[PDB]
Every structure is written in C-alpha cells, then in structure tokens.
With several copies, the nearest count.
Chain A
C-alpha cells in the first residue's frame, strides 16, 4: 500500500513522492489526461532508475529521473507546447503486471496536478 503525493504544476519540473510498501511496486509511471480524452502514457521508470521509457510524442522534450532514499520521481518538461496542457498523474505498478502503456495495470494513482501553458 503506497500513497503518492505530487507537486509542481520555460521548463516545468513535477515531482511525485511515494510513502508505503514501495518495494512491492518497483515501477513508477507518469500519465497525462486532457479533457475529452482518456489518460495517456507519458513515461515510466524502474526501481534502479537506470531504465526509462517514454511515449512516442514526448521523446527528448520530457525527461524522468528517480531519486531513491528521498523516494521521489521527477519529471522535467522542456519546450512546452499548447497540447501539453493537461492533468498529470503519477502511478505505481507491481512487479508482475505487464505493459507500461496501459493504465489499468497500475494499482495506485496520484492526485492529478494541473498544468496549463
């Protein structure tokens, strides 16, 4: 059981901090949702943090990093675009779930911090 709290919301740096049984949920993931459309995958980061995945339409514009001990994931967003306005969520996934891009595999969700540009 992990509780996720987001913050943040030039370049914009969001941060999501987890508290609880984070070991059982190694994978952390940023999702985005605009009005009139379902939430979509933005990116994902592993327990070690060395492996990262990004959506097709956010390559080289957004970047994800993981600070352990602090137990936080940072999403830094450069060269924003008008379509980037949306609510951003951070979610945790179990060890055996399968599929980064599908939000149904994620058990625990964030608050949905708004971003407008």
Chain B
C-alpha cells in the first residue's frame, strides 16, 4: 500500500469511463440487487394520508469497467467518487417529497471490489403516500407500501431483485410508532407494463394495526360518562324542572362538542366510521333521556310518573349495555 499505486489503479479505472452508458450497453440487462435497513417511521398522517420513512438504501451491481487487479482488498473510496460513476436511476414511485441527508457530508457509500462489483449506499428520508381505509376506524388495519422502480430503463436494460430474498429488509423491529404496531411486512418483485415498455419494480409493504388505548382514554370514556350523567336525571324528582332539564341540555351540548372535536382532526371522508356509529348511538341515548323527562312533564301537570321513572331507571343501563356489547362484538 504505497498509496500511489492505488491512485494509478483508480485513475485508469476512470479516464475511459462514460457515465452516459450503462454497464453492458447493448448487452444483457444489468442485475441490480437492493436491500434496505429501516431506521424509523416518524409519522403516519391520516389527514395527509402519508408516512415518513428513514432508511439506508443499498444498491449492488457489477460494472466490468470498474474491475481492477493487483490490490486484493476492497476499495472504500470517498463518497464524492459517486459523481464520476454510473449509478442506477432508481426512484420511489409513490413518494411525495424525499431527500438525501447531507451533514456533515453527503451520506453516501461507494465500495468497489476487484471483480468490478459496486456497492452504493444512501441515507434517505422520504414521505410516501399511503391511502387509508377509515371505515372501521379506529379499529382499523392499514397497508402501506414503498414502490421502487427504474425511471428510465426498461427490463431490457436493468433488472431488480432483493438481496437475500425475505432477509433483504432489516430494522423492522426498530420502528416505534406510538399509535401503530407493525403486524407484518412483505417483499414483492414484479414487472409493470407501460406504453413505453415493461419496467422492473420492487415493493416493500407494511401492515399497521392501530392501538385503541388512546381512543378509549379520549373518546369512549367521556361519552359513557356523559350518558351516565344523563341517566342521573331520572333519580331527581319530577318537580325539579330546572335541575332535570339542565342535565339534558348539558349532556347534548357536551356530546355535540365531543363530535366537533373528534371530527375536526381527520380527513373529510364521505363515509361513516365506527366511532361515528358509537357516537350517534350515545347521542340518541341522551336524546331519549331528555325526551323521557319531557314526556313525563307533559303527562303530569300541563297535560304514573313513579312507574315510568322506575322503568326508565331499570331499562336505560340495560339497553346501553346491550348496545355497547353489540357494537364491540361487531367491531372485534
């Protein structure tokens, strides 16, 4: 390692290198193996319907032009060498905005091997679209994907595959999403046909199951508590008009306020969610409580109060428990 022979070798690897031409131009296609090391998934936004992903993206191919003899060890060159080499035109099809980290330097790896093999690594943060089905929200289970494709070259010129097969993607255990948990992940390889031709594609899919604890602590519990507060009106004597109507008006106002607060933090989807069904059920329950008091007031003075009051007291908890049981069995 006199360090001048290395410079000569690297120089004559270049000096006749055309970056405009892929390896084996006009020959068989270049096989580019790919592997990913996931660092984290920072965000999963229902409003924007996308997720942010940070990863180490490693591509691996062979270029006979970059073959050297002599030096029997792998050359870990400076990342700037990547500017003077052909690299695959890989891109993420469903990305919305992505960048390569650039502090302190451009986070790039170039590693050559004596047989012309090239290992090219990047550190990429990317926001990727993920259409979500919120019909069963918040007891929903989403499928998100990252689609890797060649922009310029068809299958006649380039081919993609996963290095190590199912072991190509690592770091799935590193994900720490407070709202979600990754049930499963999958790798797929295929060819997609366009007007211009057939292009390679790789797909990395994740299945995310949402955690229900936050919505138990936020949505369901206040609704149940307000419904019970509505039930409290039945125990008060019938003659207390102000006391008995106050409970009804505050229950319905609180339920509507909960509805607005809940619906003003999600996309304006046109269909009904599970949370909407439960919320409307609780609303009609407090509504029936208020109308029960109104009907009693109409019956007694201004037209048995004890019998109907006792019947309401025994039946309302039973009916609400039955409704909750039916709902929770339906959505679980």
A-side interface residues toward B, CB under 8 Å? 23-24, 26-27, 44-53, 95-100, 102, 104-105
Contact = CB atoms under 8 A, between A and B. Distances in A.
Interface residues of B, number: 26
Contacts of A53: 173
Chain B CB within 10 A, most for which of A45, A46, A49 = A46
Given A50-B182, A50-B183, A95-B131, A44 B173 contact: yes
18 contacts: A24-B143, A48-B176, A48-B182, A49-B181, A50-B181, A51-B172, A52-B173, A96-B93, A96-B145, A96-B147, A96-B203, A98-B192, A99-B192, A99-B194, A102-B193, A104-B191, A104-B193, A105-B193
The winner among B94, B172, B177, B193 for most chain A CB atoms within 10 A is: B193
B193 A27 contact: no
Interface of B: 93-94, 131, 133, 143, 145, 147, 170, 172-177, 181-183, 191-195, 199, 201, 203, 209
Contact of B176 (A24, A47, A98): A47
Given A50-B182, A50-B183, A50-B209, A105 B192 contact: yes
A26 B176 contact: yes
Contacts of B193: 98-99, 102, 104-105
Most buried by B among A48, A95, A98, A104: A98
Given A24-B143, A50-B209, A96 B94 contact: yes
User: SS class of chain A's interface: helix, strand, loop or mixed?
Assistant: loop
Contacts, number: 52
Contact of A51 (B93, B143, B173): B173
Most chain A CB atoms below 10 A, which of B147, B173, B175: B173
A45 B44 CA distance: 22
Q: Which 10 residue pairs of A and B lie closest in terms of their CB atoms, listed nearest first?
A: A50-B181, A102-B193, A51-B173, A46-B173, A23-B133, A98-B192, A48-B181, A96-B147, A98-B194, A51-B172
Nearest to A93: B173
Among A95, A97, A104, the one with the most B-chain Cβ atoms within 10 Å of its Cβ is: A95
Given A24-B143, A50-B181, A50-B182, A97 B176 contact: no
B121 to A, nearest CB: 14
Contacts of A47: 176
Interface centre among A44, A46, A50 (most CB of B within 10 A): A50
A94 to B, nearest CB: 9
B203 to A, nearest CB: 8
A100 B173 contact: yes
Contacts of B181: 48-51
Contacts of A98: 192-194, 199
Contacts of B93: 96
Contacts of B175: 46, 51
Given A24-B143, A96-B192, 16 more contacts: A23-B131, A26-B176, A48-B176, A48-B182, A50-B181, A51-B173, A51-B175, A51-B182, A52-B173, A53-B173, A95-B131, A98-B193, A99-B194, A104-B191, A104-B193, A105-B193
Nearest to A102: B193
Nearest to B40: A95
Nearest to B145: A96
Nearest to A105: B193
Of residues B131, B174, B183, which shows the largest number of chain A Cβ atoms within 10 Å of its Cβ? Answer: B174
